[PDB]
Design a protein around this ligand. Sequence first.
Ligand SMILES: CO[C@@H]1O[C@H](CO)[C@@H](O[C@@H]2O[C@H](CO)[C@@H](O[C@@H]3O[C@H](CO)[C@@H](O[C@@H]4O[C@H](CO)[C@@H](O)[C@H](O)[C@H]4NC(C)=O)[C@H](O[C@H](C)C(N)=O)[C@H]3NC(C)=O)[C@H](O)[C@H]2NC(C)=O)[C@H](O[C@H](C)C(N)=O)[C@H]1NC(C)=O
Length: 327
Amino acid sequence: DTNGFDILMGQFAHNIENIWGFKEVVIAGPKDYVKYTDQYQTRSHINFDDGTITIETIAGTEPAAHLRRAIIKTLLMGDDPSSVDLYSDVDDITISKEPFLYGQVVDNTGQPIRWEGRASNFADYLLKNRLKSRSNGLRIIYSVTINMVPNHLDKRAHKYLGMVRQASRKYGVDESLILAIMQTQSSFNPYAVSRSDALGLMQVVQHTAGKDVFRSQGKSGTPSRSFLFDPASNIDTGTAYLAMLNNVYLGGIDNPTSRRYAVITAYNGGAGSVLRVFSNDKIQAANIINTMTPGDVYQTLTTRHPSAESRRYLYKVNTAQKSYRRR
Ligand SMILES: CO[C@@H]1O[C@H](CO)[C@@H](O[C@@H]2O[C@H](CO)[C@@H](O[C@@H]3O[C@H](CO)[C@@H](O[C@@H]4O[C@H](CO)[C@@H](O)[C@H](O)[C@H]4NC(C)=O)[C@H](O[C@H](C)C(N)=O)[C@H]3NC(C)=O)[C@H](O)[C@H]2NC(C)=O)[C@H](O[C@H](C)C(N)=O)[C@H]1NC(C)=O
């Protein structure tokens, strides 16, 4: 904890409200790419579970030209998440021949956008034929909205399978778990970043799981930001932690179906917080879960776990897994 990132993050938001007003302060999250440009007068927001691509501007002077350029930028940007500050209005020149959204959003024509020529056209279509308006209360906000292909999620999840597969055998963790979580945590968003700076596809925070993992493997110190914005490594690492919550921390839990529930919950709020729903004594806790049927452990973790986020998440990961279980 020697960051000082907090000071920038705090003035990013305020830079926003200075222009957008407190009510219109939208910002990057796990399931939402959001990038300001044009001195914070322009927003490119990808929503990875809706999954829409609203581009808005509030510049007074030439709204279209401002919008235009965001559309082309969002549609063509290559998925280099490491070269990308989702907290500056600085230009992350990430134009690639291999767009991150290629396969995930289409022309009005119905084709994939790959080069500036179609990107320009999809843009120009939308500015002449899909433009919209709302108000701050103060200024008009001009908006374009783009829906992504209906299976954008499993089209996005496809990038990370080779990674999930490798990490699943290395550590012993079911890919289904890895995907369920990865899905639930980021909707497969490589740009994913939390308010509590959990990072990347598996929403991993450097100074808890990232430390403990690095502490296995035999690595003094702590995972780099770039490191977690490598899908290959973030998936390595979230998985490594899943292994860990199961071998050590929640390994005193007898029943493996019960243990998984603990693991999942724990993956989101810590093993200490899981065990602490039964006893403040980590042994007594394990003893009590072994008193139970995996369904009552589920129904406990789902009803009595202190975090709202963590109760609503078990059903999310447990449910996503059922889908991923079969091949
Ligand atoms: C929405 O996305 C966010 O998700 C990630 C998961 O995706 C959330 O991050 C999880 O947050 C947990 C903190 O809430 C964190 O667990 C804490 O983990 C550490 C590390 O293992 C535990 O401390 C270790 O504890 C053992 C003792 O059991 C000691 O041996 C170790 O030495 C400790 N090691 C280190 C390095 O500290 C900590 O538990 C201990 C025991 C404790 N009682 O303090 C554990 N927390 C709790 C309550 O038990 C997870 O590590 C992390 N998961 C991942 C993958 O990173 C994130 O949560 C935030 C930060 C939150 N809950 O507010 C999610 N949410 C947001 C909003 O961003």
